Each structure stands twice: as structure tokens, then as C-alpha cells.
Amino acid sequence: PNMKIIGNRIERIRSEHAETWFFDENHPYRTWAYHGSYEAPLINGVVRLLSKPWDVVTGVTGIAGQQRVFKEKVDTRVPDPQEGTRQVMSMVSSWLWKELGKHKRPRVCTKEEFINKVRSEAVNDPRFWALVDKEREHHLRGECQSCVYNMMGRAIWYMWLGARFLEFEALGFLNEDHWMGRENSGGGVEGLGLQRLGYVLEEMSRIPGGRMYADDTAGWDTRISRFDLENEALITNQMEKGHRALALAIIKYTYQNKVVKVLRKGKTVMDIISRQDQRGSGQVVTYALNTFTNLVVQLIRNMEAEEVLEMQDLWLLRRSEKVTNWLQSNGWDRLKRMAVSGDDCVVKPIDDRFAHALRFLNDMGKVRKDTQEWKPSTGWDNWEEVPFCSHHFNKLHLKDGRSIVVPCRHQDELIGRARVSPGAGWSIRETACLAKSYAQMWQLLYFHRRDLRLMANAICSSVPVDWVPTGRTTWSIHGKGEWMTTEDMLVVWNRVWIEENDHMEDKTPVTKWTDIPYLGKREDLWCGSLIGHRPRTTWAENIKNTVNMVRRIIGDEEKYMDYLS
């Protein structure tokens, strides 16, 4: 650990718990530096009432310990990549940052920009912004007192709103100005909704070349190296001095010299640990930086596949001109052959040599999940089967014959998520408004699933028509929230799928839900439908009674609409 960079944060924590602070010689940390310890101090009823057949489906109820996740997934170390591999990573990262910045200029994001985003509160308190100003002052002198994570076990690293603001101030431009949008990056998909991603995969399927590859990197955030963090930091070279000072401090304390608080006769202690590599999951620009580095990784894999990089280049890259020529000649074409959303990627290489191009990938520590380290990847011939962003995408037809490309995933995950309510002491109003959000999201994106179109209509029939949807149905950047409204969902469906859909040539509106298709029965069943299963048949036959019961609970004096008739 670099005690000159992390010492101030450790001292501040120690000062706040001086009388319980202690050093535990039997701590379980192996790859994280350990500094000390101190003594530390759900269910959506509306959806559950309307989804009885899923009470006994473990794929649903399972959706609703920290030390265990830490020991197995976060407390690991990987060897450094070889010198040649590191030179290739830096060259490709430098080239990519220059391409992304050709038509965009970095900028500082404002307090008002952050305030407008949070209203979707400590922000309306002048004392919170005073804390923010004090920490900024330390950063401008080369010090950090409070940019510390609280690790909560997949591992999510939390940070106080003030540190997130300082990160947004210095690097939020990557998000706000869409540096990873498809127009700017070629291979990125930032800003596209799930309603558009299938069309991107279908466009890629038509580019001549090999199969479509969609390999996952096992524990992506844990495999981000100190070299990846240095290459991501090259964006500071495009910033003016003042902005650069703010960004260099975020990179130094939040990204590269991290300090984390983790919990461990029924008593609990908090441990203070540190690590220089890995991605601190949950940062304001975690998604943009993951997309950046995954684009760099896939460009390198394509160079190895195309024999631009040879096995002698792992040890030392003697001559760099071949890599520069490949990036200038082919880089943009290869970026357009990718769809990269953070750690998720689909690549359409120029041939199938990509399947066995694993030397640089493995030397970089970007090991594929569920495949033997040196077994060639298996590509897909059918774009409709390619996994991307936890979905697959299928082409269906409206009653009038027009095709549409819709997102799909196994239905248990969707119902399981809708049955979860984050927050205790929640009234039936907050609960019903979050249920309405899920149901309207299903009407917009998963209308082609028989069980979800019915369940959504039952939920919408059970919640007062004037109640505004609230809460978050997903954390995915591809969930644009068009369903968070009291506007008629058939009107919103038309806006999303017809009017604003550049892949729908004929703009004729759709005037009835019966013109909007379902998947074929076989596909609906493959993806988890309970159509034809007796408990589901009973639930559908009894659905009007179940809706009347929910309306009685919420209040028969409210105004309801029958979306089931």
C-alpha cells in the first residue's frame, strides 16, 4: 500500500471510532492490504398477490454472506501481463481515446447537472455542498480525506453522495456527452434502449465475416488491472489544467488507491482494507470505463486473430508500426463489428480465427467464463440466439405483416424482480406504484410473453389509474423508463416501436393490442412460460376475482380501469 495516498483516509476512519479501533492479527485478507478494524453498529405485496403460480417456482422466489462473496470472488490476484502485452494495451487505449475525443471535448459537470439527475434528499442541504467543497479543496492540494467505499456483498461498492458528486464533476462528461454512444465509438451502445439492441445485433449479423462471438469475462470488475486503470486514465491528456487536477485526484483515490470498509457472540466488526487494482463497482463512470477497456480488449483479440500480433510480441513489442497501421486502416471497421455495453460484448470478426485468439486475452487476465482457458470460443450462427445484456432478441411480425425485433429473457427473472420491493415501512401506495412501473415496462418491452401481458394487465387493472409509477424496475442503462408515466401505454408503445423506431420504415400506427404479437408458443415455453400448466390456467381463469380483491385492499373508492377486458 502507498501509505502517502491512503494514510489520510485511514486516519480519518480511526478518528471516528478511536475507542473501538483494534488490529486483528487473524483477519482473513490475503490479496488486500489490511489496516485495522473497529466495532460496527422486502416483497411487493401487490405483485405477489397477482402472481400466485410463481410462489412455488424457485427461479422466481430465489431472486428475493458478504465475507463469503469477498473470499471467493474479490480476494484474488492475477499475474501482471507481459511487457509487450502492456505496450499493445497502452497503444490501443491511446488510439481509442483519441478517436473518441475527435468530435467531443471533455468538460466539468456541474452541481446543477447533478441536482437535476438526483430528482428522478441531502442535495437540497447547503451543508452537504460544504462537505463537497472541503473534500474538493483537499483534492486540489494532492490529498484525500473521505473517498472511501463501503463494500456490500457480485460485489457492490457503495460511496457517499459527496464522493459520487466529485467523480461526476471530473469524469461525468463521458456519460453526459455520450462518449460511448454508438455514433461516437462505433462499438458502444450507450443511450440505446432494449427496444433497439436487437436491431444492432441484426445489423452486425449482415457484416461479412465469421460467427458472432459473445464471450463473458468471469468477474470482469475483479479482472481490471492496474495497467487497465492507467490506460483508462489517459483521457486526462485531453483535459485543460483545472479540470485535469480534479480528474487526476478522482483517478488517484477512487480508482487506483482504493480504501474500503467491509463488515465481518453475535457481534460484528468493520475492517478497513485497500487495493490498487480492480474496478470499484458502482462508480458514476464504471460503465463507461468498462466499455472503453472492453473495446480495447476486443481490438487486441482481433489483432491477434488477424496475425498482426505474433506470440513473440507478448514478451516485448519490438516495432509498433504494424499495430498503428492496423488501427488506422481497420480500427473503425472493427469497432463497428462490435456491440459493447460495459463488460458485455458481441463481436463479428472478419473470420473465425477470433475463436482461438486467446494468448493476449489470457495474458491480460481477461479469462472467459464457463470455458476451459485454452478451449476455442464457440460462436453463434443465428443472431437471434446471441446473448447480450442478459437478453436475446427475436424478430416477430405485427398483424399487418411488419417485422419488429424484441428483447426477451427467461420469464422467471422478470417476475422474480417485480416481486422484490427495496425499502421497509412501505405503504400499499408506494408498493402499488412500483408494481405499476413493472407492469408498464412489461407492456412496452415484454408484451410478447403471454404470462407477462396478462399479469401486467391485471396489475394495471388493480392500481388506481391516476397513480404515477415510481421506483426503478432496473439499474441497466438500457432501461430508458418510457413506462414511468400515466400516458396510455398503447400510445407510448406506438411512439417507441413505430414513430421513433428508425428500423420501422412504415410509420402506420398500431391501434389495438391484439395487433401486437406474442412469441410462438414453443418459444414462450422455452423461455419459461407457464401457459398450459394447471396452476397458471387456474390463475388466469380466476384473475378478475384476484384483481377485485386487490382493488378492495387499495380502496374501492379509487378509480380503476379494466385492462383485462
Ligand SMILES: CO[C@H]1C[C@H](OC)[C@H](c2cccs2)C[C@@H]1C(=O)O
Ligand atoms: C443486465 O440486466 C438488465 C438488463 C436489461 O437491459 C439491457 C434490462 C432492462 C429492462 C428494461 C429496460 S432495460 C434490465 C436488466 C435487469 O434489470 O436485470
Ligand SMILES: [Zn+2]
Ligand atoms: Zn477524496
Ligand SMILES: [Zn+2]
Ligand atoms: Zn426468449
